[PDB]
């Protein structure tokens, strides 16, 4: 969960390589998108849209084995100075779009690194961020210019718990090399099923393999398979996705003066061509 | 007077006459500009390039920070550098469109195959500008681009390595690399491009534009 | 009209030029004022104004400090290096890639000789040439875009 | 690092140029020559 | 990101023709 | 877009008109 990134990697969700720590546990891979305007003026509220698409009509394995829908979460790194817009400055139509999203900073201070979710996949297939652009005029250490935004969006249950132990939304290889004899199936009355399995004969051999319910087996009895080969098929239908983009904290005077200069240029060009036209005449009169 | 002053000594008039005696034939359309736009792009590079040499610091400890200084605290630094960036890409592009006009106009054929050859050389030089400038901010992108291309030449047998060590200042990318790339970008390549631009244009003034289609 | 002067085909000097394919700046509209002094500035100012406009609307970014221990995931050369880069990464024998790269300039040099056989400028009157050009152009654009895809999905451009 | 605007710009100009170039060869391949060659 | 590329391509391509036609028209209205 | 289009038209428009405007203005006070 977004809040496990903070727990295991407190300082930042992003490694020097650009890879986000989510991937460290959500081992699958699905597309992720960000949308911000190309430019924003200083001190303005604008929309920043995260997209986490997936097949809505498809469920995944729950911890015990059920088959529930799946949820989405995300981390969104905006530029220094940027922050979630104050509620009273979010106009209504936007407020409707955003929803009951509990934007929470990665750590105290990092108000531009926002964590989001668990949120219900069905409706938060895309996620609006009302964000407020900083102002170089009242924060002398925030400058105009073009900055990066990094996204790290997920959907579906992870594969490793902050403790280290695997979850059940992945496949369970095989403990040893050789011949198997018995596919049992416990169920201690609290912790559900455990399709137990052993492998033997080769070097003496007797060793066991407990495997949590949720996946499907595509194994059958008596096989002679190797040490670490797929005996469990793959349950995961979620997976993690990244996306980077750029936004321009634009000073309007840069634009206004540029437009001026452009006009001056079109004007000079005119005068030049007209001048040629005058000369094109004189030249006929020779 | 003056025309007289200069005419008496230097023969300014003959100069005026070579200019006012070249004519442009009907077949020369707008694409015959691409060469001059490619040049205009470069002059822009020379101006803004030179300007940035007054603040940029070619040291692994200093380079990146000097770039953010030019962006943030230098007067119009953001503009000057944004121009250098854009106009760098525009030069390469206009050069390509220029090569298109040449080829789809047969203007590279006898007696102009040296203009074409010096042109190819110009294109290699320009790409060299781009590659070296790319690495000067000594940021993540620029640094890993160098770390990748610099190794390419090691496949070449006999020399390969030696070539690579030569244009990176040793084994591995580091300060020596940045130092050498800075020399390249702001001293070697500007002189080379100037020579071969000189030859390009001289041969052109001598032979005039290619014929009609 | 514009303003025009016809080839003085009675000038043996101009004829001896034209003969070696080379008298074409002797006739047409006069370059001085007309072109050099009136429209050249329009092209220069125009070229400058477009770049300035782009520079202001989409200014240069500053990336992260280079880290010699941390390879970026995203890591491309500039656009005009895409094709060569596609070639370089997607050809497993390194010396073959280097050679294929050098072949681009070296090859391009040979062209005027290779195509010196006939004397045609117009691309329609040299169909073989114009074809190999368009083919090469296409393969270039293709390779360039391919640089932009993941390596496995690179050559198929993700369609087959 | 990639910058589409530049890429889209490159493409539109490459195809517009290649186009206009063939258009000009054609327009001349076809009411060609005059005034002497 | 990708919407930018298409905008840029369409416009760089097509606006050429707008300026072209505009030039040709300016010519028509001056007479030659 | 739609607002971009409108502005664009109008921007060119003013200028085309300043051109045409200025030939004649200039022309029929005999200057071209």
């Amino acid at each position: 969960y977004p809040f496990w990134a903070q727990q295991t990697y407190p300082p930042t969700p992003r490694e020097p390589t650009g890879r986000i720590v989510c991937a460290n546990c959500h081992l699958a891979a699905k597309p992720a998108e960000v949308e911000v305007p190309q430019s924003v003026l200083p001190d303005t509220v604008f929309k920043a849209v995260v997209k986490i698409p997936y097949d809505t009509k498809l469920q995944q394995v729950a911890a015990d084995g059920s088959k529930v829908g799946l949820n989405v979460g995300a981390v969104l790194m905006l530029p220094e100075g940027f922050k979630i817009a104050p509620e009273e400055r979010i106009p209504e139509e936007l407020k409707k779009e955003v929803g009951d999203v509990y934007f929470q900073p990665y750590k105290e201070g990092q108000d531009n690194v926002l964590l989001v979710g668990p949120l219900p996949g069905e409706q938060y297939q895309e996620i609006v961020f009302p964000v407020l652009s900083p102002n170089p005029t009242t924060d002398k250490n925030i400058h105009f210019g073009k900055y990066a935004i990094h996204l790290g969006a997920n959907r579906g249950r992870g594969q490793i718990y902050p403790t280290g132990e695997k979850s059940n939304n992945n496949v369970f290889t095989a403990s040893a090399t050789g011949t198997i004899t018995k596919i049992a199936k416990e169920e201690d009355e609290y912790g559900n099923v455990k399709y137990q399995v052993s492998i033997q004969t080769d070097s003496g051999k007797t060793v066991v393999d407990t495997i949590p319910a949720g996946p499907e087996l595509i194994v059958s009895e008596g096989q002679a398979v190797k040490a670490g080969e797929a005996l469990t098929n793959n349950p995961n239908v979620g997976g993690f996705g990244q996306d980077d983009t750029e936004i321009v904290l634009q000073d309007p005077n840069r634009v206004k003066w540029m437009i001026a200069f452009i006009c001056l240029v079109m004007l000079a060009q005119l005068m030049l061509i007209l001048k040629k036209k005058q000369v094109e005449k004189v030249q006929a009169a020779e | 007077n003056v025309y007289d002053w200069f005419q008496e000594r230097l023969e300014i008039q003959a100069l005026a006459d070579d200019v006012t005696s070249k004519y442009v034939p009907p077949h020369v359309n707008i694409f015959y500009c691409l060469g001059g736009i490619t040049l205009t792009c470069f002059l822009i590079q020379f101006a803004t390039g030179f300007a940035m040499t007054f603040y940029y610091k070619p040291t692994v400890t200093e380079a990146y920070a000097s770039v953010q200084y030019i962006m943030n605290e230098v007067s119009f630094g953001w503009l000057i550098r944004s121009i250098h960036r854009w106009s760098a890409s525009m030069m390469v592009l206009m050069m390509i469109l220029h090569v298109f006009r040449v080829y789809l106009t047969g203007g590279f054929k006898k007696p102009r195959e040296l203009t074409w050859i010096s042109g190819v050389i110009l294109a290699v030089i320009t790409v060299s500008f781009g590659v070296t400038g790319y690495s000067l901010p000594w940021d993540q992108v620029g640094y890993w681009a160098v770390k990748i291309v610099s190794g390419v030449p090691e496949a070449i047998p006999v020399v390969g390595v030696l070539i690579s060590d030569l244009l990176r200042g040793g084994s591995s990318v580091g300060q020596a690399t940045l130092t050498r790339y800075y020399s390249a970008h702001t001293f070697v390549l500007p002189w080379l491009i100037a020579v071969f631009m000189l030859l390009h244009f001289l041969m052109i003034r001598k032979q005039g534009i290619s014929g009609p289609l | 009209m514009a303003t025009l002067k016809k080839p003085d085909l009675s000038d043996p000097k101009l004829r001896a030029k034209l003969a070696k394919g080379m008298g074409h700046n002797y006739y047409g509209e006069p370059a001085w004022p007309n072109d050099l002094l009136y429209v050249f500035p329009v092209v220069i100012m125009g070229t400058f104004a477009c770049i300035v406009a782009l520079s202001v609307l989409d200014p240069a970014m500053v990336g992260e400090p280079a880290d010699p221990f941390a390879t970026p995931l995203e890591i491309l050369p500039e656009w005009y290096l895409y094709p060569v880069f596609q070639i370089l990464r997607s050809v497993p024998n390194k010396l073959l890639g280097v050679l294929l790269m050098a072949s681009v300039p070296l090859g391009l040099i040979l062209v005027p000789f290779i195509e010196n056989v006939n004397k045609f400028q117009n691309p329609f009157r040299r169909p073989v040439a114009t074809t190999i050009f368009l083919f090469g152009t296409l393969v270039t654009i293709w390779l360039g875009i391919g640089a932009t895809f993941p390596l496995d999905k690179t050559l198929t451009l993700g369609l087959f | 690092m990639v910058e589409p605007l530049l890429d889209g710009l490159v493409l539109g100009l490459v195809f517009a140029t290649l186009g206009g170039l063939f258009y000009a060869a054609y327009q001349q391949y076809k009411r060609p020559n005059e005034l002497g060659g | 990101m990708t919407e930018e590329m298409l905008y840029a391509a369409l416009l760089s391509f097509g606006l050429i023709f707008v300026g072209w036609g505009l030039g040709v028209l300016l010519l028509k209205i001056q007479g030659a | 877009m739609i607002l971009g289009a409108v502005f664009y038209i109008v921007f060119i428009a003013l200028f085309f008109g300043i051109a045409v405007g200025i030939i004649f203005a200039i022309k029929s006070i005999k200057l071209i």
Partner: peptide, 29 residues
């Protein structure tokens, strides 16, 4: 948030107007 739009537009306008002035000036292709 649409001085921004005039901004981009002005780019498109000099791009267009330059080509226009070239063609016009040299009666051009």
């Amino acid at each position: 948030m649409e001085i921004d739009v005039l901004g981009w537009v002005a780019l498109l306008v000099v791009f267009t107007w330059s080509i226009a002035m070239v063609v016009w000036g040299r009666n051009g292709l």
